[PDB]
Design a protein around this ligand. Sequence first.
Ligand SMILES: COc1ccc2nc(C)c(O[C@@H]3C[C@H]4C(=O)N[C@]5(C(=O)NS(=O)(=O)C6(C)CC6)C[C@H]5/C=C\CCCCC[C@H](NC(=O)OC(C)(C)C)C(=O)N4C3)nc2c1
Ligand SMILES: [Zn+2]
Length: 198
Amino acid sequence: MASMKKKGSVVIVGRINLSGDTAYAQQTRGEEGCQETSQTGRDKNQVEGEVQIVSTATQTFLATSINGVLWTVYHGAGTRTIASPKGPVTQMYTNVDKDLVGWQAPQGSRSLTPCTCGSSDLYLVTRHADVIPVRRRGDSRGSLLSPRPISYLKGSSGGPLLCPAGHAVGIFRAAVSTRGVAKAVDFIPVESLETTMR
Ligand SMILES: COc1ccc2nc(C)c(O[C@@H]3C[C@H]4C(=O)N[C@]5(C(=O)NS(=O)(=O)C6(C)CC6)C[C@H]5/C=C\CCCCC[C@H](NC(=O)OC(C)(C)C)C(=O)N4C3)nc2c1
Ligand SMILES: [Zn+2]
């Protein structure tokens, strides 16, 4: 009992910059400071933007602010706290059945607006700041206009699917692949986030 360890916090280690004409990834914390911040849960770095790059000791993925909540996937974050300036912050939403978790959005983040356009021409933002056109094919599925090996999507769970107007349509959850090629994506619809919020 006395030797039982505690899992560290999720740590924001960068962001996908979508503020201008060019999307690009930025790193805000190196691996060493990440490990220390994960243990203490104390992250004094200023947060900016809608899409964060997050890490644990063993995984890296994305997290997306929508409606004042920073959302990501349960298969990345588990039940972990997230680091913040004043210490670990406990999840506000947890739903393993949807592969979904959420924390209060960090001070300084900006939130995406939930999409009400009803459009099926979507855009997936990856951890490498690729903007991938995706045609919506169902409530939780969309096809890549240009399929790519799954290597190019690995690490992007928790990222957004956006409509042409830049609203949040869903959270990237899983890749649909045949012989290692991602032809489609599975995502958590924003309406499912809004229901979780109730
Ligand atoms: C632990 O409790 C739970 C609860 C609910 C749950 N629901 C789930 C649906 C679920 O799927 C598992 C995790 C998820 C996943 O890899 N996503 C990411 C990702 O980037 N991840 S990540 O950032 O690298 C990471 C690993 C966090 C750091 C987006 C894709 C990028 C490349 C695909 C790699 C090849 C795996 C292809 C799987 N295709 C797949 O299952 O397709 C369907 C059509 C769904 C069968 C897949 O995509 N997979 C399996 N796991 C869970 C686990
Ligand atoms: Zn929209």
